C-alpha cells in the first residue's frame, strides 16, 4: 500500500545483465570444459581479489573462472547425469564457497609451484586479526600515519577531514592542515586504529585503506584439481579441511 520508500531510477548507461550474462557464463563453461585437460578449483577466503587481473595476464594461456559458485557448480554438473566428464560432479563438492575454476593444459607441479610462490601484501579487509598495532603520531597527520619517516612524507589531503571524523579520529583543521590537537604536537595523545592480536572491523579497515597501509596477505589457495584424461580428482592439501559442499 502507501507509506513505502521511493526507489531512485538511476541515470545509468548500464542496466542489469541477468539471464543474458547467465547464459553467456553457461555457454562459456560448456565451451571451456573440453578444451583444456585440467580444471583446478581454487579459493579466495577474505581477500580483495583485485590481483586476479595480474594472475590472468600471467596465465594468458590458461582460463580462470571466478563467478557465482552455484552457477558454476551446476554448469560443471553436480550430479552424474548432467556432467560433461565423469567426475566433474566429484569436483562440484570442492566448488563450495568463494571459490573458482582454472582450466589449463599445463602441469600440476608447475601450477602449485606458482601458487605457492605467489603472495602479495594487500589491505586488511574485515575479519582479519591485526598482526600489529597502528597509531598515528600525535600532531600534523600525513598521508602515511607514521610508517614512512615524516621528513620524506607529504601532508594528507584536506578533503578527507569529514571522512576521518566520521570514522572517528578527533582531527581538526588548523591553517589548512589536518592535525590531532595542536600543530606542534603535545596537546593530546595519539589515536590507535587497531591493536595487535585483535579482530578488526569495517571502520578500522576503512581507516587503514585511507591511510594506505596494508596489513593482510593475498594468496590464492587451491582446494583441489581435476584431470579429465585419467578422469580423476586430487584433493589438494587445503581442500582437506575446507567445509566441502
Amino acid at each position: 500500500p502507501k507509506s513505502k520508500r521511493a526507489r531512485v531510477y538511476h541515470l545509468i548507461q548500464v542496466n542489469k545483465k541477468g539471464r543474458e550474462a547467465k547464459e553467456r557464463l553457461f555457454s562459456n563453461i560448456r565451451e571451456t570444459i573440453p578444451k583444456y585437460q585440467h580444471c583446478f578449483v581454487f579459493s579466495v577466503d577474505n581477500m580483495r581479489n583485485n590481483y586476479l587481473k595480474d594472475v590472468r595476464h600471467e596465465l594468458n594461456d590458461c582460463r580462470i573462472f571466478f563467478g557465482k559458485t552455484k552457477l558454476m557448480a551446476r554448469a560443471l554438473g553436480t550430479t552424474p547425469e548432467e556432467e560433461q566428464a565423469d567426475g566433474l560432479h566429484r569436483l562440484t563438492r570442492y566448488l563450495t564457497g568463494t571459490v573458482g575454476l582454472l582450466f589449463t593444459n599445463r602441469d600440476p607441479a608447475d601450477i602449485e609451484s606458482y601458487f605457492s610462490n605467489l603472495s602479495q601484501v594487500d589491505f586488511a579487509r574485515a575479519g582479519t586479526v591485526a598482526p600489529r598495532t597502528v597509531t598515528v603520531p600525535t600532531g600534523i597527520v600525513y598521508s602515511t600515519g607514521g610508517e614512512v619517516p615524516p621528513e620524506h612524507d607529504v601532508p594528507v589531503s584536506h578533503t578527507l577531514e569529514p571522512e576521518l571524523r566520521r570514522l572517528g579520529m578527533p582531527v581538526r583543521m588548523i591553517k589548512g592542515k589536518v592535525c590531532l590537537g595542536d600543530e606542534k604536537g603535545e596537546a593530546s595523545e595519539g589515536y590507535t586504529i587497531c591493536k595487535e592480536g585483535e579482530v578488526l572491523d569495517s571502520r578500522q579497515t576503512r581507516l587503514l585503506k585511507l591511510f594506505s597501509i596494508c596489513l593482510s596477505e593475498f594468496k590464492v589457495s587451491l582446494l583441489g584439481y581435476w584431470n579429465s584424461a585419467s578422469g580423476e580428482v586430487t584433493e589438494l592439501e587445503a581442500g582437506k579441511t575446507r567445509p566441502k559442499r
Binding site: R165, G168, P170, R172, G181, D182, A187, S188, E189
Partner: protein, 190 residues
C-alpha cells in the same frame, strides 16, 4: 487484514534479570537497575526458552505489528544499556574565544550541571541540568572534548542533544562561525 498471530523474540544474557509486571519492565545487571513503562501498547509477554522473552500480538493490524517491533527494539535497548551502557563523546571547537566548560555534581537532586562560558565571547553563562544517572567527564585523552556516559540510552542522547542545542549561534553566518559543542562518537562503555 487482521492478522491472527504475530510474534517477536528478544534474547537476554546470562548476567541480567528481567522482571516484567503488567506492562512495567525492570531490568537489572552489573550496570544497575532500569525501569520503563509500556502500558500504551497492547502485547502479550511470555517465556519461550530458558533465556528468550516472546512478545506476541493477536488479531492486530500492520500498525500493531509495527508497535510490536518498536517495543522489541526498546526492550533490547534496555538490555544493552544494563549490560554495556552508553557513551557519547563530544568535542568543542572554537576560533578565537576558548570555550570554558565546567562540570559539577551537587548533593541536592543528585544530578550534574554543565556550565558553558566564553562561547563566542558571550557574557552569559549557559547552565544545563542533566537527566538523572548520566556522568560527565572532561577527559585528559583529547583536548577540548567531553564524555557523557550512562545507563539509559534515551537520557544519554537527550542530554547530549540538550547541550548541543543550548550552544548554538544566532544571527551570524553558519558557513563562517563554526564554533560549538558537537557530538562526535556514539557507542558503548565496554
Amino acid at each position: 487484514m487482521r492478522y491472527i498471530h504475530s510474534e517477536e523474540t528478544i534474547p537476554v544474557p546470562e548476567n541480567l534479570k528481567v522482571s516484567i509486571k503488567s506492562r512495567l519492565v525492570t531490568v537489572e545487571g552489573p550496570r544497575g537497575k532500569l525501569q520503563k513503562d509500556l502500558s500504551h501498547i497492547a502485547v502479550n509477554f511470555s517465556v519461550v526458552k530458558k533465556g528468550v522473552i516472546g512478545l506476541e500480538i493477536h488479531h492486530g493490524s500492520r500498525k500493531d505489528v509495527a508497535a510490536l517491533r518498536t517495543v522489541r527494539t526498546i526492550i533490547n535497548n534496555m538490555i544493552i544499556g544494563v549490560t554495556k551502557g552508553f557513551k557519547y563523546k563530544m568535542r568543542y571547537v572554537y576560533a578565537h574565544f576558548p570555550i570554558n566548560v565546567n562540570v559539577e555534581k551537587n548533593a541536592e537532586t543528585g544530578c550534574y550541571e554543565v556550565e558553558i562560558r566564553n562561547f563566542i565571547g558571550e557574557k552569559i553563562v549557559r547552565k544545563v541540568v542533566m537527566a538523572p544517572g548520566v556522568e560527565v567527564e572532561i577527559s585528559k585523552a583529547q583536548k577540548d572534548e567531553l564524555i557523557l556516559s550512562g545507563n539509559s540510552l534515551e537520557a544519554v542522547s537527550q542530554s547530549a542533544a540538550d547541550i548541543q542545542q543550548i550552544c548554538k549561534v544566532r544571527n551570524k553566518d553558519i558557513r563562517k562561525f563554526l564554533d560549538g559543542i558537537y557530538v562526535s562518537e556514539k557507542g558503548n562503555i565496554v
